Amino acid sequence: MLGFLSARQTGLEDPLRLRRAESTRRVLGLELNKDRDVERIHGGGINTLDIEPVEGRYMLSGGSDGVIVLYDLENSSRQSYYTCKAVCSIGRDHPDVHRYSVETVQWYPHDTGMFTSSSFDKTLKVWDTNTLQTADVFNFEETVYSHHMSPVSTKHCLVAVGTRGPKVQLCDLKSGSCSHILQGHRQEILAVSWSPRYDYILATASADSRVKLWDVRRASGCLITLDQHNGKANTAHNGKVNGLCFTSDGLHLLTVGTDNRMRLWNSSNGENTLVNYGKVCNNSKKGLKFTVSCGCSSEFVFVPYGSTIAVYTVYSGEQITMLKGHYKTVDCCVFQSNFQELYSGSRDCNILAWVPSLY
Amino acid sequence: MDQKLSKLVEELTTSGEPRLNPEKMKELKKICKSSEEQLSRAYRLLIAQLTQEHAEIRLSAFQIVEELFVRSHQFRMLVVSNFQEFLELTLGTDPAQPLPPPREAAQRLRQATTRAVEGWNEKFGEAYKKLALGYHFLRHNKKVDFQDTN
Amino acid sequence: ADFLKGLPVYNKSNFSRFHARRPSVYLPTREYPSEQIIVTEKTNILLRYLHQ
Amino acid sequence: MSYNYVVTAQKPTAVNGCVTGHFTSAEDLNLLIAKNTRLEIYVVTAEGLRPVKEVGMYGKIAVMELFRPKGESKDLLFILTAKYNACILEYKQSGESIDIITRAHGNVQDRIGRPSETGIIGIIDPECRMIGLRLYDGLFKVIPLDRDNKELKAFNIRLEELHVIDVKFLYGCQAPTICFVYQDPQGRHVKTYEVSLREKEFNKGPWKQENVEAEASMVIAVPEPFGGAIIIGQESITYHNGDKYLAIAPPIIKQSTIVCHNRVDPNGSRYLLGDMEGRLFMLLLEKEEQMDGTVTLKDLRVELLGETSIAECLTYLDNGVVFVGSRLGDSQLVKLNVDSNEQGSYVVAMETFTNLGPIVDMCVVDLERQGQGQLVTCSGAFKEGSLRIIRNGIGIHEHASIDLPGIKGLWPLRSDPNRETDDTLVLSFVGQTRVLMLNGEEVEETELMGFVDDQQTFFCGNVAHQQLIQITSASVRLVSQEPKALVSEWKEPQAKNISVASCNSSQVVVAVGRALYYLQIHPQELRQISHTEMEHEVACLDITPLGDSNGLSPLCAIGLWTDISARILKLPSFELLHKEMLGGEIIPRSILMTTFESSHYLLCALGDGALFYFGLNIETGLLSDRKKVTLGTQPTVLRTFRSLSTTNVFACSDRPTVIYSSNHKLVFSNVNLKEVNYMCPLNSDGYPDSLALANNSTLTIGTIDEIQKLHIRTVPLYESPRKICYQEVSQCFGVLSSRIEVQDGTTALRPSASTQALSSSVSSSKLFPHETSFGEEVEVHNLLIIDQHTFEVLHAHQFLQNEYALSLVSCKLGKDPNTYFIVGTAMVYPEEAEPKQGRIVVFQYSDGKLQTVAEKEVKGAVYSMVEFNGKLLASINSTVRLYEWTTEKELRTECNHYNNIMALYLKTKGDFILVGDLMRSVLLLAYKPMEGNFEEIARDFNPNWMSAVEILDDDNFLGAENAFNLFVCQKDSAATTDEERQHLQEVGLFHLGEFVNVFCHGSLVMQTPTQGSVLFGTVNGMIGLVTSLSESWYNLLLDMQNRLNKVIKSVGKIEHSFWRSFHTERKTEPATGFIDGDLIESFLDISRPKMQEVVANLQYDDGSGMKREATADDLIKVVEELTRIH
């Protein structure tokens, strides 16, 4: 650790090199912190975690029991051991409480005040955080399996919703309309994710074993369909592609299928890069959420691997590690790139924190 | 010394009596107190006995584990390091691995394990929050009734 | 050393009167219009590749 | 809020880029050097590197390239900044109007993308058709260089090779071909692509993909007729030309890593290579010509030309001269003479340009004990490591040094009337006088006819009507110039002794006790005009003619005993015009009337070092605006001297000073000599535009700088210096040093400072295992005790093997009165991710002999330590602990605080402790003297990778960023909750553009709008000054900054706001609470009409608190005060 400090001081290595090397070392040393904890309020499993984007202080956890918890990661206790208290929570007491499980929760990428929560109740609600009241509501005909808002979009705040229905929905928050409908899929779309690089590109994965990349401008047809074999067909996996996430820079896309395979693709032309990630066990019938690191030498991907968390490499494929601790299958993994932290919400109603321990 | 520890563990686990012999248990405790390596070997032997397909052997091994947990800090560290496998072997949490016969001895083992885990959470939950977590994992997630007779 | 024979001399006088003064700072005040501006073509790479 | 002001005391000196070409004219070789934000343009003339210009860019120049598109008379310059500002500029010199026209400008930043591990790369085609930028891995940005279109549309191209080590554009290929070395899990491969503009894509390259050395790191595009490329790794130089593959693995290269290259011959026959060790090689390509007539490559040959400064970027200038730019050491200008010297080295160091950075650590020490703080900095690394003493002042370049002790006066004299230059130097002694002749450089004893050598001279010189004068204690003697003979002699009526003398060309005023006599100089007569008696004995006199009076002073300045009063008298009446009571019981010893910037002054120096200065009205004889300064403790002798056609005053004393005037404000600058007693200007043939100076025993003749500067002395250590702290009691400097020794045991590569210490000891701790293979390097650390005066390593204490000294503090602990060197050390074994052991060692440098007073094993590495109320606050790995100095001279653990990821920087003030975490920003703790824990008063939760911290005051805390930014946090004491209080509000932000390593309190200016002062050092050797400001002054400065932004047009059209905006990988906000010193100071350099435009309708307070209409002269004065502070 001293060598990097000396190199930075002398200017042999630019500060970015020390930053990236130290971040990689810390991510390698991720371990289940016994001291830090997050108070167990959820009565059921955790279907999603999402730390706010602007400063990574507040995290949103949606539970299987329909309870939303706005945890605060700011350590106000001044103690090495401390419990991340729930600053506020929407539970059964609150009238607008999601009756059923809340599948995903995602802050407004522009303003930290508002955040979106979609539930198995057939509804997607936009809450504020000044009063934690449901600012807006959208009701669908099929249970919202996933919902995402473009993080690189300032012109529109379009929300892409994938439900049991095979038609993707696009709704405008500013105009308060659910007008747009994209068609072409055959069954429930389990994962929708905008491309961070290109504003108007949406990647949609379904249980039809296909990943379709669309341009919202052209309301006619889908741009591309990822094929594992590159035409040597037109299918991302042998089962259900229930996990989808772009790489931090948006040049690659990671797809996790029920065939227990994780595949990397070029985001530009959609040909399988053929990275062999091995058997990534995945038996979840619901959309599986996985997160990719940011600002690290090698982009890590954290995939819920049964009841552990498998950390691989996005640009090599080598299985960096398998963090254990959770008693039940891990459901959601959210990575705080600010301090190279990880927070996984398993169905055991626990929010386990994983931190780089170096001594 | 190691062969003596192995023989004592075997005799204590294969005796089949509902209660451990106090003299052999005192000798075992003295050996576990004489060296930390002997304590770790006793731990490994008890784990290997919990894998046996006999509920009386598992019960006796659990009683030894409980006594060493209450009396030894490093044995507590060892048990916590592998608390998941311990709970699987003693309560039969995994439905694919039911408790071995006889049924009455398996029930007694389950009751004793539940009570011991309860008392361990009561006495050491603040520091040993790990074992505490699993406790609630079986308590609420697994709806294990602590007040149930069986 | 035969290999040091022929180092290319741009001008014979350069460094001929070498002697063993810091530059004056340039502080422009006038403005001459920039002939060209560099704007990154926003053309989506993936759209271009697909259409190709 | 918080208000701050940042100025650059020293411009960055580390050379980032270097390029030769034809920039200023198509027929002139021009060298362009990028030093961070500075771009120096020199011309390679016969004299040397004549500095044409220096351009200040609002951005860090990461890419520099000289490209000449077909049809361009002279090469254009392409600059990319670290903020991704791209600009194509051209030189245009119409007569004297030098301009840098921004032909193209824009921003090529992309919204998202990983910065490349190898960094920004910028390349241009051989034909100058497109500019390729590798900014983010996986994307290659291409800017087509089309002239017709108004808009240059830069477009990205996908790269299937994310990890691209290096990229270059190939010659000898029709389409633009890029050859690049890229890495993947298999290894490193060299690949080729064709850049298609119409398609805007990449096509299969001419060659195959071929494996290269595992450390293939550099690519060289060999031009015609060779073609192909050369791949340089660490052991093997390979050459790929399609099928033709060559490889050579010399053993000489394997020792070091080649980091820079340059092409000597245009046809690529010869190349220059420079390694990290500093060695300079020449790579030879042996062309062979086939019978067909095509020339190809026969074999590669590498030859070690010699040893030069650690090369950052070499550039063969011309005629065998090579500019070895350096970043870790002084830049060099070497000559590759054909014949090697006896040492076997072909390189001769022709010149050395001083490089101040990297500044690992520094101190402000009043070594002189005069009050002028000098900056002692640890600069460089490896063999280039050294100490730099930046003493503000003015420097003499003496050319003569005679041995004459006890001189009492010096006078320049012109013997021959025809010769307009002096040729004589008269000297004064104990009741005697000596004359010296100046025959070029010959300086020898003579006798002059009419002058007496048996009386002490008080003045002599050249007077009106082709004559000479000599005034002694006995008489005043008039001598004709051409015929050396006494033509007139005057004595006091009763033949009494002259006591004081003054003289210009036509007038004499002498004192005889209280008596005063006014004499005029006429052909062969000393005409006594008038006489008076003063109230007291006369101390000093001056009759210097000022303004438009034509060599005839109406005024006489006089200083008197008893009343200590500087008086202005009328000539010839001797009427009192002004009497000024100076105070004290110390008499005036020197008095002078002078004009500084067409303003008249009276200077009066007392025998106690004091100097009074006054405004002088030469009509009324009125003295006004009385100001007083101290200039040493000895009596000051004042003497005027012309320098660059400007009048100054030399003030001789224990502290040589030059008095001058800056913007109608007298400025005092310290000369660089121990003590000057007497001085005179001298302009002979062998000593033109020079100075004669005398002290107790030596007579020196030298030149002098017109003004002052940060003169920098250099003390080479030949090993990397890390920390420095000054021990006042022992008059010694304690420096941590590290040198690399190769396994043999181990032997040092070269002689260093640690080895040649006058006394070398070694630590042999009993508190405390690997087999270093032959040729493996090991870092050996030493503590060097260096005398402050001779700056020679008096002592060197080598630590244990595999022990790194990380922290050093010089302080006294507890009730122990002795001052100790407390050094923290860790043990870095190769296979440990972080150290597992360490120790704090307390040494005492006594009677010239260091001794290990005490020691304290500790688990972990002592990153930093600081004195804290007599207690040692030590950061050990993930903990901060307190130790106390017991009566047994031992350290005793008191308490520890685990709420610190990694305390890397510690600062204490009163009961506060500012902790700089590696990535957790700044914490603020307050130790408990009753309980014993470090109650964390406040902290900043923004994720900030810190490089330095400082405590501006009880509430403001200054911190640096890993991305070249400065911020200032404030403890919200106005908070009404424990929550708001625990949060430090980031009240100021700024983008310095430099990586600041060390902060230190102190100022380099002899001791105001600006309060407080913190100097700071950066990796680029850029010393900067940060100070506070009042709210009104900050508001005025911010408004003037905006107006200057309006008026001043930056090079490249980069907005200053966009340049100083706080910028990181996670956020980008404009600068706030900070005033850019350089832009404000540039107000002094904008023409008067531009001054008026800038100050147009600005509301300002002239000290009355009333918003007046700020003028161009109000703001100028405001800026002259700010400049004075640094």
Residue numbers in the entry:
A (entry chain A): 1 to 232, 240 to 366
B (entry chain D): 1 to 150
C (entry chain C): 2 to 21, 30 to 61
D (entry chain B): 1 to 744, 748 to 771, 777 to 1015, 1022 to 1140
Question: What did the original publication write about this model?
Answer:
To investigate the binding of DDA1 to CSA, we assembled part of the TC-NER ubiquitin ligase complex and determined its structure by cryo-EM at 3.4 Å resolution. The first and third WD40 domains of DDB1 (BPA and BPC), CSA as well as the N-terminal region of DDA1 were well resolved, whereas the exposed second WD40 domain of DDB1 (BPB) has multiple orientations relative to the other domains of DDB1. Due to structural heterogeneity, USP7 and a large part of UVSSA are invisible in the final reconstructed cryo-EM map. The VHS domain of UVSSA (in pink) binds to a corner of CSA. In this structure we found DDA1 to interact with both DDB1 and CSA. The interaction of DDA1 with CSA is in a similar area of this DCAF as the DDA1 interaction with DCAF15, but the details are different, as DDA1 has clearly rearranged itself. The DDA1 binding groove of DCAF15 is not conserved in CSA, and we did not observe the full helix in the interaction with CSA. Instead, low-resolution densities were identified around blades 4 and 5 of the CSA β propeller. We could visualize DDA1 up to residue 61, but the region where it binds to CSA was poorly resolved and we could not build any model with confidence. By applying a mask and focused processing, we found that the densities in this area adopt multiple conformations, suggesting that the interaction is at low affinity and transient.
TC-NER is initiated by the stalling of RNA polymerase II at DNA lesions, which triggers the assembly of the TC-NER-specific proteins CSA, CSB and UVSSA. CSA, a WD40-repeat containing protein, is the substrate receptor subunit of a cullin-RING ubiquitin ligase complex composed of DDB1, CUL4A/B and RBX1 (CRL4CSA). Cryo-EM analysis shows that DDA1 is an integral component of the CRL4CSA complex. Functional analysis reveals that DDA1 coordinates ubiquitination dynamics during TC-NER and is required for efficient turnover and progression of this process.
